[PDB]
Amino acid sequence: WGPGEINDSTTVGPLLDGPYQPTTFNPPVDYWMLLAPTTPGVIVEGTNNTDRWLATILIEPNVQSENRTYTIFGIQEQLTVSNTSQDQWKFIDVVKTTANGSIGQYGPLLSSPKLYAVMKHNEKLYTYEGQTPNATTAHYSTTNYDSVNMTAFCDFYIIPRSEESKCTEYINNGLANEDIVISKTSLWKEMQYNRDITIRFKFANTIIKSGGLGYKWSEISFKPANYQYTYTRDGEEVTAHTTCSVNGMNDFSFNGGYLPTDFVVSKFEVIKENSYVYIDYWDDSQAFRNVVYVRSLAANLNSVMCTGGSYNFSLPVGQWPVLTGGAVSLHSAGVTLSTQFTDFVSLNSLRFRFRLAVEEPHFKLTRTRLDRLYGLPAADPNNGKEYYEIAGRFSLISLVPSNDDYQTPIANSVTVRQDLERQLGELREEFNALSQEIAMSQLIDLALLPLDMFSMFSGI
Amino acid sequence: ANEDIVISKTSLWKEMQYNRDITIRFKFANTIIKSGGLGYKWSEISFKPANYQYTYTRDGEEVTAHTTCSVNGMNDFSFNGGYLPTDFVVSKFEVIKENSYVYIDYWDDSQAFRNVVYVRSLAANLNSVMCTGGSYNFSLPVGQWPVLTGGAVSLHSAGVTLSTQFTDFVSLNSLRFRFRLAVEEPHFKLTRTRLDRLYGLPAADPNNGKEYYEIAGRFSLISLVPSN
Amino acid sequence: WGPGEINDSTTVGPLLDGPYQPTTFNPPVDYWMLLAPTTPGVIVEGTN
Amino acid sequence: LPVGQWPVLTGGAVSLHSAGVTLSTQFTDFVSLNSLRFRFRLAVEEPHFKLTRTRLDRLYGLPAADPNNGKEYYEIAGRFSLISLVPSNDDYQTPIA
């Protein structure tokens, strides 16, 4: 008895983020921005209009010294292109003070996977220069380190700060009809238990981490909760271990964007009319544990309404979505007993299924692509309630293993109090009163006959 | 009330051991659902409960077997090559691991498999069978298609599960044989991708370009039956 | 003897192929294409 | 029991009465003793004795599992009378040991 073995799906994309489309944004603090070039041209063009005009340009190999017109920021420019190493692609770094000022070339830059990142920290901008494995992180130091706007043209990767070594490794490398009788027949009997049983439970699930800055959630769903409660059934104390779970939910996916600034959910489980809540009980009372392989159970219970509301989500920027309205009804149905099989012993568990009926009002999610949602959300299934108390009558007609008041030595009763003896005074009175009923000659002839120990107690 | 009620007097039950070899041959099915409009964005390719019918001669007796294959515990993995409307991106994909078990539903007319409703014990004497993963070709109108290679996973013994739904209509018999998936070599590698080293039976090709998967199992069932 | 009820991991997938961003890609035929402006000015340029 | 709920024995109660006495031998380390052996008959009583978690019920007696019941001693108070023969060569100097 204890936590049941109900296994759910694992995390969906715990640390994997797809190549983002070319979009304009600002570099988040303490997050590397890896770049994945696709076509020759500008990769990152970040402008602050004060001193920074960085523009990384792809250079095709096997090109001699020639003057080629190249377009930067929509303006063509004459530039001499050359390559001292024809076996690797050259990534020339361009730094400029004004719109069309002096051109600062930084390099050469060579790497097998052709992957690099741009990030700033502690009022300095880290730039990668060298050839693997001799790359060195140079620093650019100039005032007005504020956020810059970059006109993206390829795929970008966002990586958490704690994986800086992983960022370096990505830069360097990248991604028949036979029965043997065991024993004789087993004596069993059928009995019915009528009990006053209360149903009390609490849902418990907080969060599952994901990638990015934490806006996206890999799996915000329900998890089997193991809590210890105590009730009083039929006027006697009963301690209970409660396991709460739900199976049969519908997993919906929200994709309103593909950036860490928009509302994106990897996987969210939603309550459905086809979903059923599993409730487990483990008590120490002899009455409860004896309910195994029970032939029939009837649950004369009462409907209890459950509501859900808004939930608090930890986000660095922006506001978390909220849920307005919604209610579900729990209804009684058939109960189930499972037989989890270890080595040669049948481990049995109790599972109570409650049917779900979504009623008005319908759940509405703010800042989402779908409204009028049905079923309780997996974020805040309680909304101001701890236990959903359910009082009812239970009938338990089970095959209890117990032979009878038989199967016991017949002489196994408390010793009966031994009888007493007639009072010696009454004995004397009776013997004295018996005088008249004696004959004379017959008594004399009996006295003539000798007696002995065997002749004395013939009638005794 | 709080009193004890006995509907009937003493009832008789006996425990017996049933040793029978049960040959298992199954085929997988998948629920292929695509995103309407492009065909390049694979939203989700999950499994499908496969249903077939067979009749076998096990040690000289014909038994009509109704077969159903199901899986519980599915792990989810995503293959994202970008977010463009033309690249190779899989939103959600189904992968099985040691976490998940496979449900096998042998609905049989034999006396032994009819009497096993309240089960006491059962040993699964199974020989591990290697099922190397197959390959699946997508349905892009143009362009190259990713190819699945390797992915052999054995089906080790994981016991059984026999539960009955005690509803007020009829006691629903739900028999399913548990199967443990152990990873071996080779794994699953996707061509033209930066991601490889995946496990489990594939969810893309149901039949894997093959036929009935052989699982030669043995069952020593311990159950309860009436007698006199 | 038939279908059971002990089932886990019932999931469904998206149907809108996911959101898009401004990219110079050709539109497929026999499928409607809605446009949502984000910045004033030029929206779409379908030219041969 | 390492797995599952272990069985627990409960109940069991008896009474002791004296039905005989004679001499006996007892030693502790190296000292021989001439002890008195009291014979006791037993009686079955009211309290129930059962083995839960199983099908053992409605039995009477006292199990050989935990008769100590926490108490480190069982008290029996009574009076015994014996008459001894002592070598008295006269009507004085009567030995004691």
The β-bridge partners of D42 are: D16
Cα–Cα distance, B137 to B147 (Å, whole number): 7
> What ranges in A213-331 are assigned the alpha helix state H?
286-289
Across the interface, of A250, A256, A276, the residue whose CB is closest to C12 is A250
Number of helices (H), then strands (E), belonging to chain B: the values are 1, 16
Paired tokens of A396: 């338990």
Cα–Cα distance, A241 to A283 (Å, whole number): 7
The β-bridge partners of B125 are: B218
Strands A149-150 and A136-140: unpaired
Is the Cβ of A19 closer than 8 Å to some Cβ of chain B? yes
Closest Cα in chain A, distance from residue D83 (Å): 31
Backbone angles phi, psi at A169, to 5 degrees: -70, -35
Is the Cβ of A438 closer than 8 Å to some Cβ of chain B? no
Strands B41-48 and B89-95: parallel
Contact B101, B179 (CB under 8 A): yes
Question: If we measure between CA atoms, which residue out of A165, A369, A373, D37 comes closest to residue C36?
Answer: A369
Contact A220, A208 (CB under 8 A): yes
Q: Do C17 and B37 touch (CB under 8 A)?
A: yes
Q: Please list, in sequence order, all residues whose beta carbon lies within 8 angstroms of the beta carbon of residue A116, skipping any fewer than 6 positions away.
A: A34, A35, A56, A91, A109, A128, A171
Q: Please list, in sequence order, all residues whose beta carbon lies within 8 angstroms of the beta carbon of residue C11, skipping any fewer than 6 positions away.
A: A9, A250, A251, A267, B44, B46, B74, B76, B92
DSSP A85-103: -TTS-EEEEEE-SSSS---
Strands A236-247 and A276-283: antiparallel
Backbone angles phi, psi at A100, to 5 degrees: -135, 45
Summarize chain A as % helix, strand, coil (round to 5).
Answer: 10, 40, 50
Cα–Cα distance, B64 to B107 (Å, whole number): 8
Backbone angles phi, psi at D88, to 5 degrees: -115, 95
**H/E/C letters for each residue in chain C?**
CCCCCCCCCCECCCCCCCCCCCCCCCCCCCCCCCCCCCCCCCCCCCCC
Is the Cβ of A186 closer than 8 Å to some Cβ of chain B? yes
Q: Do C7 and A248 touch (CB under 8 A)?
A: yes
Position A233, amino acid: R
Q: Please list, in sequence order, all residues whose beta carbon lies within 8 angstroms of the beta carbon of residue A50, skipping any fewer than 6 positions away.
A: A144
**Tokens 């040691």 — which residue?**
B98
Q: Please list, in sequence order, all residues whose beta carbon lies within 8 angstroms of the beta carbon of residue B35, skipping any fewer than 6 positions away.
A: B41, B42, B43, B91, C13, C14, C15, C16, C17, C18
Q: Do B78 and A13 touch (CB under 8 A)?
A: yes
User: Which secondary structure element, helix H or strand E, spans residue A453, and what is its range?
Assistant: helix A453-456
What does the angle CA D8 – CA A337 – CA A186 come to, to the nearest 5 degrees?
55
- Mapped onto helix, strand or coil, the DSSP state of residue A448 is helix
User: How many CB atoms sit inside 10 A of residue B136's CB?
Assistant: 19
Is the Cβ of B114 closer than 8 Å to some Cβ of chain C? no
Question: Residue A153: left if φ>0, alpha if ψ -120 to 50, beta else—which one?
Answer: alpha
Tell me how the structure was determined. cryo-EM
Backbone angles phi, psi at C29, to 5 degrees: -90, 155
Whole-Å CA distances, A168 to A121, A125, A137, B187: 16, 16, 11, 27
Cα–Cα distance, A201 to A195 (Å, whole number): 19
Question: Residue A115: left if φ>0, alpha if ψ -120 to 50, beta else—which one?
Answer: beta
Q: Please list, in sequence order, all residues whose beta carbon lies within 8 angstroms of the beta carbon of residue C5, skipping any fewer than 6 positions away.
A: A276, A336, B165, B172, B174
Question: If we measure between CA atoms, which residue out of B54, B73, B57, B78 comes closest to residue B65?
Answer: B54
Paired tokens of A441: 């000659």
The β-bridge partners of A66 are: A81
How many CA within 13 A on the CB side of residue A154? 21
**Tokens 């629903």 — which residue?**
B172
Question: If we measure between CA atoms, which residue out of D54, D4, B159 comes closest to residue A1?
Answer: D4
* Residue A221 per-residue DSSP state: -
Q: Sign of the C-alpha dihedral, residues B213, B218, B223, B226?
A: positive
DSSP A139-194: EE--S-----EE---SEEEEEEGGGHHHHHHHHHT-----EEEEEEEEEEEEEEEE
Position A356, amino acid: L
Paired tokens of A337: 């007993």
Paired tokens of A408: 């016991």
Contact B115, B199 (CB under 8 A): no
Question: If we measure between CA atoms, which residue out of A300, A289, A287 comes closest to residue A193?
Answer: A287
Question: If we measure between CA atoms, which residue out of D2, B4, B56 comes closest to residue A234?
Answer: B4
Paired tokens of A348: 């049995």
Cα–Cα distance, A158 to A21 (Å, whole number): 12
Q: Please list, in sequence order, all residues whose beta carbon lies within 8 angstroms of the beta carbon of residue B217, skipping any fewer than 6 positions away.
A: B21, B22, B23, B24, B124, B125, B126, B127
User: How many CB atoms sit inside 10 A of residue B31's CB?
Assistant: 16
Paired tokens of A87: 């076996």
CA-nearest residue to D57 within chain A is A405
Q: Please list, in sequence order, all residues whose beta carbon lies within 8 angstroms of the beta carbon of residue A14, skipping any fewer than 6 positions away.
A: A209, A210, A211, A218
Cα–Cα distance, D56 to D52 (Å, whole number): 7
Contact B24, B104 (CB under 8 A): yes
Contact C31, B55 (CB under 8 A): no
CB contact burial A8-40 (16+ within 10 A = b; e otherwise) = bbbbbbeebbbbbbbbeeebbeeebbbbbbbee
**Tokens 């085929």 — which residue?**
B27
Cα–Cα distance, A57 to A90 (Å, whole number): 9
Across the interface, of C1, C4, C25, the residue whose CB is closest to B176 is C4
Cα–Cα distance, B166 to A335 (Å, whole number): 6
Q: How far is CA B109 from the centre of its chain?
A: 21
Q: Do B43 and C13 touch (CB under 8 A)?
A: yes
**Which residues of chain B does A340 touch, with a Cβ-Cβ cutoff of 8 Å?**
159, 161
Across the interface, of A187, A289, A414, the residue whose CB is closest to D44 is A414
Contact A178, B218 (CB under 8 A): no
DSSP B102-145: EEEEEEE-SHHHHHTTSEEEEEEEE---EE---------SSS--
Contact A234, A245 (CB under 8 A): no
User: Which secondary structure element, helix H or strand E, spans residue A247, and what is its range?
Assistant: strand A236-247
Chains that touch C (3 or more CB pairs under 8 A): A, B
Name the resolution in angstroms.
Answer: 4.7
Is the Cβ of B161 closer than 8 Å to some Cβ of chain C? yes
- Return the number of CB contacts < 8 Å for B and C: 76
Contact A150, A46 (CB under 8 A): yes
**H/E/C letters for each residue in A311-331?**
CCCCCCCCCCCCEECCEEEEE
Query: Length of chain A, please?
Result: 460
Whole-Å CA distances, C2 to B55, B100, B174, C9: 17, 22, 8, 20
Closest Cα in chain A, distance from residue B203 (Å): 15
Question: If we measure between CA atoms, which residue out of A271, A279, A253, A136 comes closest to residue A201?
Answer: A279
Is the Cβ of A240 closer than 8 Å to some Cβ of chain C? no
Residue A316, preceding peptide bond in cis (omega within 30° of 0): no
How many CA within 13 A on the CB side of residue A150? 26
For chain D, report the end-to-end CA distance as a whole number of angstroms: 56
Contact A57, A41 (CB under 8 A): yes
Cα–Cα distance, A376 to C42 (Å, whole number): 43
Cα–Cα distance, D62 to D48 (Å, whole number): 10
The β-bridge partners of B154 are: B130, B182
Q: Please list, in sequence order, all residues whose beta carbon lies within 8 angstroms of the beta carbon of residue B161, skipping any fewer than 6 positions away.
A: A338, A339, A340, A341, B103, B176, B177, B178, C6
Cα–Cα distance, D53 to D4 (Å, whole number): 11
Computed over its alpha carbons, how large is the radius of gyration of chain A? 44
Cα–Cα distance, B213 to B211 (Å, whole number): 6
Question: If we measure between CA atoms, which residue out of B98, B122, B102, B106 comes closest to residue B25?
Answer: B106
Cα–Cα distance, B33 to B44 (Å, whole number): 6
Contact A373, A267 (CB under 8 A): no
Is the Cβ of B70 closer than 8 Å to some Cβ of chain C? yes
Q: Sign of the C-alpha dihedral, residues A263, A269, A271, A277?
A: negative
Q: Sign of the C-alpha dihedral, residues D37, D38, D41, D42?
A: negative
User: How many CB atoms sit inside 10 A of residue C3's CB?
Assistant: 12
Q: Do D44 and A408 touch (CB under 8 A)?
A: no
Cα–Cα distance, A282 to A334 (Å, whole number): 19
Cα–Cα distance, A249 to A273 (Å, whole number): 9
Q: Do D60 and A414 touch (CB under 8 A)?
A: yes
Question: If we measure between CA atoms, which residue out of A218, A344, A359, A197 comes closest to residue A279?
Answer: A197
Whole-Å CA distances, A128 to A39, A113, B108: 21, 14, 68
The β-bridge partners of A55 are: A45
Which of 130-159 (A) contact B at CB < 8 A? 155
Whole-Å CA distances, A346 to A234, A337, A349, B120: 30, 12, 10, 6
Cα–Cα distance, A348 to A398 (Å, whole number): 14
**Which residues of chain B does C22 touch, with a Cβ-Cβ cutoff of 8 Å?**
none
Q: Do chains D and A have 3 or more beta-carbon pairs under 8 angstroms?
A: yes
Contact C33, C25 (CB under 8 A): no
Which of 74-93 (D) contact A at CB < 8 A? none
